[PDB]
Amino acid sequence: WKKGKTVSIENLNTVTDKYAAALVPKRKLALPVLPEGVKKAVEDFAASVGQ
Amino acid sequence: WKKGKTVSIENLNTVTDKYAAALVPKRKLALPVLPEGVKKAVEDFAASVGQ
Secondary structure: OOOOOOOOHHHHHHHHHHHHHHHOOOOOOOOOOOOHHHHHHHHHHHHHOOO | OOOOOOOOHHHHHHHHHHHHHHHOOOOOOOOOOOOHHHHHHHHHHHHHOOO
8 A cells, every 4th residue: 555556456365365375274184186077087987888 | 702803911801800709708897997098197186186
């Protein structure tokens, strides 16, 4: 913020991003989330062998 | 084979294909062979989550 200026939505969002970065724990578990591209690729192969 | 003709390698191969078709059992197990494209796609995702 500047005495003569006017704050923009972009600066407000980048500051909000730093707040969300603090919510991220310094150490976290690498819990694997199955991607849809991988999920369906496996399902297609399983259906190819009739399973 | 024809009295005036001469057999070609293509006809001999198509006849050999029928012999190999007889080796295929009428009923068989759908044993799934993991494709390289699927094998590496899974390995890439596992390495992406650090595993």
